[model samples]
Target chain A: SLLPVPYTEAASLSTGSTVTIKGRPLACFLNAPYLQVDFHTEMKEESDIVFHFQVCFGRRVVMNSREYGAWKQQVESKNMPFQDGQEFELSISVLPDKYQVMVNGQSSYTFDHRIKPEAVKMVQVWRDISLTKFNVSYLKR
Target chain B: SLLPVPYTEAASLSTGSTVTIKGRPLACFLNAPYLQVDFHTEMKEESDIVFHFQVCFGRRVVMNSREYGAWKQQVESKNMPFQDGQEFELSISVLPDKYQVMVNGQSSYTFDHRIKPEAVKMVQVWRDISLTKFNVSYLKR
Candidate 1:
């Protein structure tokens, strides 16, 4: 509603950084609409992705990394905290050892560091969703 | 870049109707960006589709129909008329017996009518592309 989909923001992540997004699926969950978030090593969209998180709404979520243009091991989950036909708040926080994902104020998933969070220079959020808000925290001291 | 992605427009069709769309993929060919145009039986997004045309950039295209909330037979094609990283003009013309799709002025694909053109109450253009122009002819007598 406010921000555009296929949104891209130059981002920086450290142990204390948090990325927050507010969005809603463009279609019903029964249509298998998707939400994808990719943290890339460069501002270019084709650059290597350090963290790739994708959700096939009402179905499953897949996480992986694209290193040197090749996809690494994948982590798939069926833990769906996204409610169909409703707006959702997604929060991803960078920790020392892993990235923690929270959905609507509840811990939903976590991914251990495959690439250092410091490697991320851009974050892109795309796929079948309407974005209203996006922010990357810079409170680290 | 002028119009938004995931654009939807209420439309009407007949034997002489034609739909025109001008768009470009949001990502490059290697990323397999998609372009989808669905003719719906209702104005609501979840309504059954009279025609479903989906293009996987630099890859292939698939067409189908969803009736009574169930998807029917599928027609998959390897016609890659869409160029990598370039804008495309797509035109879908309603013929007496089928829908003829033209890409950048060249015939690309066709689909036999499973549901009459009159059943289409809405047309939705979405997925990994940025739409610039969308029009549906209303000149039928």
Candidate 2:
């Protein structure tokens, strides 16, 4: 089993903040691979996810939230845009209306806020994938 | 017609900085539709462009530099990735060897430094397009 790599620095997300993830899936990942990106209210707890983005190989991309110990109705996109063993870039931007996601430069999906976006302090990454770069920055308005 | 809008903030191009521009061309934009992103030492004079990325419809996409009052030999990409009146996203990341560019989620082109990379203090966008969003930020190394 592969281990999850967490961000060393905390990500501060706001109306104009953008987080970029660049890397590729392991060559054998088509078997049972999954990658998850989480926005946490606290640094070290699995229960407080403000936003959750997960993609499962041979399955759908799931977008959801876990607050007060319950999972919300998950948002799913049937458009599977990833290829195994290929490098890709995923960007998530915090907009006023929704959290916009782009995979490899194309618009993927947008998740509406179930929890206040300001409550997010740390961003976590859990994947059976390999990552080469991660970035968090407040963009120019 | 509304004039093309420039970014309100200056982009600081460090090693990990990325600038994403999202916009659509006007519906009838076949005459001379082109967009240029300039890494400028100073914005006033035309001679200060360290890197120039310009795409003209029906013409080749050109990458060039203006140094010491002369235009360098232009690097051309025959693949015109943008479609008329469609929304597009362009992401440019500053790398140690080159400035990597991606258009609408695909690798487009790379421009090597003609001048020192640090000479770029400001980034400006100008001419023949409409912009919906502009983001400039440094990613976590």
Candidate 3:
């Protein structure tokens, strides 16, 4: 269970059944380094097309697209099914697919386009976003 | 002295230079936050000629322009001396402007345009740039 991290400001998300974290520009303040959820596929006919999430931190891109990229491009998949009110999570993680984007815990997104996966050190949320939590981890893992 | 505040990584900066953080495109990874600093300013240049120290999580602008809007901007010359291979500290403080900016101890650049700031959290650094010390701050205050 990805705990619901507390926030200083709450965001209300509802876009015609297409909840997303793509257009809202949120600052990483006391509630930074948080997670953003997005829905609605980019397929031609909503037939569950294969697309990946691309995360960039400055000039360095993730070495593995399954975890980091610039545009969250298209990826190979088994055509996962997404339902409404499904929660997702995306943040710096401990593997190639560092972004653990979960759709109602029923689907996941991946990115495979980064030149230096280790250089990704910044985090922010965008478009139709709802900030869940944030922090400054001093513990060196 | 907010010592031991761990940062993901540090870039080598020169006393008399301007460095640009240009890796990630701010579109993937959902919410990713990063920081950048611009050092030195033309002593005689004026007229709202704005330059910025920007931070974007995912190509989404978060903190830009002079300090004290939603995100605090501080300019300190007493502790800023533009030294040789000395790493100055930047941190979150009570007034946000409490972070020290070193440059010749008693002499440094002035942020002449810290008025009427906006919530345009998107960042971009360009044009007649003299950034001698590239510094960056996160959601700390």
Candidate number 3, chain A TM-score: 0.34
Model 1 alpha-carbon drift over 4 Å, by segment: B139-141
Better of 1 and 2 by DockQ: 1
Could you give candidate 3's per-residue lDDT for residues A36-77 as a string of tens digits?
A: 322222211111212223322111122222232233344444
How good is the docking of model 3, by CAPRI class? Answer: incorrect
Tens-digit lDDT track for model 3 on B25-109? 2232232333343321222111121234433422432232333223355332232222222332332111222222222333223
Better of 2 and 3 by TM-score: 2
lDDT tens digits by residue: candidate 1, A50-72:
99999989999999999999989
Query: Among all windows of ten consecutive residues in candidate 1 chain B, which has the lowest summed lDDT?
Result: B26-35
Q: What lDDT score goes with residue A71 in model 3?
A: 38
| Every model's TM-score | 0.91, 0.47, 0.24
- Cα lDDT tens digits, model 2, A18-100, are 99988765432323356678898876544477888987755689888888766779888877777666777999998887899
Cα error, candidate 3, residue A65 (Å): 6.4
DockQ of each: 0.63, 0.01, 0.02
Candidate 2 CAPRI classification by DockQ: incorrect
Candidate 1 retains true contacts at a fraction of: 0.67
The TM-score between candidate 3 and the true structure equals 0.24
lDDT score at residue A60, model 3, on the 0-100 scale: 18
How much is the lDDT of residue B100 in candidate 1?
Answer: 98
